[PDB]
Amino acid sequence: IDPFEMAVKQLERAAQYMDISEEALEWLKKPMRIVEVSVPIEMDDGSVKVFTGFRVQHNWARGPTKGGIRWHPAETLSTVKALATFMTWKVAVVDLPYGGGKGGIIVNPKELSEREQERLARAYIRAVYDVIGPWTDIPAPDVYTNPKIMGWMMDEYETIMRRKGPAFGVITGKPLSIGGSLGRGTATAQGAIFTIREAAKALGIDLKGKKIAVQGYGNAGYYTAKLAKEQLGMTVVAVSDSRGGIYNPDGLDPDEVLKWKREHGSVKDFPGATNITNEELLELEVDVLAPAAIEEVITEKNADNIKAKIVAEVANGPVTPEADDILREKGILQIPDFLCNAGGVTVSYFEWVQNINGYYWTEEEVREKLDKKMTKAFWEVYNTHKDKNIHMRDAAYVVAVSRVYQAMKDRGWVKK
Numbered sequence: 551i552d553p554f555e556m557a558v559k560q561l562e563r564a565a566q567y568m569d570i571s572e573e574a575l576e577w578l579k580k581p582m583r584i585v586e587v588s589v590p591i592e593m594d595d596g597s598v599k600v601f602t603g604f605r606v607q608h609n610w611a612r613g614p615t616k617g618g619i620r621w622h623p624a625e626t627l628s629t630v631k632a633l634a635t636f637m638t639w640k641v642a643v644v645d646l647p648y649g650g651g652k653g654g655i656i657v658n659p660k661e662l663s664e665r666e667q668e669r670l671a672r673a674y675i676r677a678v679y680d681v682i683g684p685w686t687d688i689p690a691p692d693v694y695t696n697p698k699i700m701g702w703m704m705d706e707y708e709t710i711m712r713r714k715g716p717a718f719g720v721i722t723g724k725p726l727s728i729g730g731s732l733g734r735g736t737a738t739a740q741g742a743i744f745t746i747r748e749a750a751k752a753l754g755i756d757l758k759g760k761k762i763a764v765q766g767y768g769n770a771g772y773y774t775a776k777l778a779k780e781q782l783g784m785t786v787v788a789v790s791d792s793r794g795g796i797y798n799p800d801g802l803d804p805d806e807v808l809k810w811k812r813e814h815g816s817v818k819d820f821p822g823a824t825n826i827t828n829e830e831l832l833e834l835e836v837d838v839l840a841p842a843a844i845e846e847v848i849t850e851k852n853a854d855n856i857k858a859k860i861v862a863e864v865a866n867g868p869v870t871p872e873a874d875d876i877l878r879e880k881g882i883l884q885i886p887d888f889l890c891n892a893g894g895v896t897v898s899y900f901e902w903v904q905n906i907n908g909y910y911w912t913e914e915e916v917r918e919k920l921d922k923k924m925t926k927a928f929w930e931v932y933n934t935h936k937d938k939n940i941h942m943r944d945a946a947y948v949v950a951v952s953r954v955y956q957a958m959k960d961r962g963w964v965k966k
């Protein structure tokens with residue numbers, strides 16, 4: 551069904567546990583500004599192709615909107631709106647002076663060359679210039695966008711802006727040479743590790759030697775497993791990808807599995823590990839389960855089979871609303887997705903702060919600040935969950951929507 555409708559339904563279902571006026575709810579149920587533009591580029595054959603670009607700013611009560619740009623053939627304005635709405639709550643829950651934004655281009659980037667990709671990024675910046683800026687809207691990498699495209703976009707924005715202000719802060723996730731930030735590549739996994747470590751403290755479980763199963767082995771999942779092994783002292787016993795999964799009760803080495811995957815395409819048939827499927831990985835007896843591949847992997851048809859103490863929603867929306875109640879019934883602590891993977895946007899905020907301040911931090915300072923922020927956010931959400939006797943997802947919504955609502959009231963946008 552429609553992604554924006556599902557996001558609105560999640561907001562409405564959460565709103566029953568908080569005291570928010572109906573006018574504020576109606577304000578929050580629709581994006582404040584939506585921009586749809588034509589993005590023309592000159593192809594390598596000389597023809598001019600026009601692409602459809604999107605730029606959604608859901609709410610900027612707490613500050614400039616924040617959100618990445620995704621390049622995808624199945625990209626829809628409804629998906630952009632839903633993701634911007636979720637970005638609002640994600641920045642609100644970790645207490646950032648940000649609002650929620652999202653961008654997208656309907657394009658198959660695999661059919662474009664390097665020059666065509668650079669032209670597409672520059673044309674997108676030239677088209678959405680009037681609604682973005684260091685204090686207006688800060689994009690970032692997302693699906694099929696990378697630091698290289700971010701650098702191209704930053705250069706185009708600086709050329710248009712005539713270097714009048716800090717042009718580095720218009721976009722995050724850029725290379726370290728042009729105002730990048732240390733700790734960006736492991737941001738999401740590091741934040742997820744911090745939240746898992748705090749959840750173990752909440753449940754009174756010592757993680758030094760426990761089992762973790764990670765679904766997905768991209769930038770997020772592989773680093774989640776690596777940091778869980780080295781920082782949390784855990785034993786990775788199962789990793790998977792779009793092809794299949796592997797299992798090893800003794801433990802798996804994330805670096806070796808990554809090297810094997812880079813060579814044979816997938817992680818399957820890893821030396822000394824049972825082969826499994828993606829569905830069997832979720833139902834494996836582990837202490838922490840971290841789905842980080844796609845959305846809606848845990849539904850009402852397989853939630854009774856989850857036997858992990860902690861479910862770390864590293865991916866976006868990997869658990870259906872109907873499965874939340876089933877998981878909570880069995881006694882499983884779940885870390886909501888827009889809280890578990892907020893480390894990426896937190897480090898993006900740190901990069902933006904460094905850009906607008908003209909002063910850049912070291913790796914240790916970035917990691918320490920991220921640890922403080924993630925620990926505080928998790929404990930706020932968990933205390934709200936415990937006091938109000940509601941689901942962790944509902945508690946995170948209560949925390950984020952309350953902040954956005956208070957900002958809206960203080961601005962005078964809503965009088966009630």
Ligand SMILES: NC(=O)C1=CN([C@@H]2O[C@H](COP(=O)(O)OP(=O)(O)OC[C@H]3O[C@@H](n4cnc5c(N)ncnc54)[C@H](OP(=O)(O)O)[C@@H]3O)[C@@H](O)[C@H]2O)C=CC1
Pocket residue numbers: 738765766767768769770771790791792793816828842843844845864865866891894
């Ligand atoms: N910055 C980040 O990393 C952030 C991550 N997230 C979420 O985490 C998820 C993954 O992030 P990221 O690592 O960047 O993504 P990548 O595209 O880098 O990797 C995704 C991984 O998922 C695997 N996968 C794809 N489809 C399936 C499937 N049907 N079953 C099992 N595994 C599958 C892929 O395997 P294969 O290699 O074979 O394709 C790949 O290993 C996304 O949902 C994303 O929104 C959340 C916020 C930010």
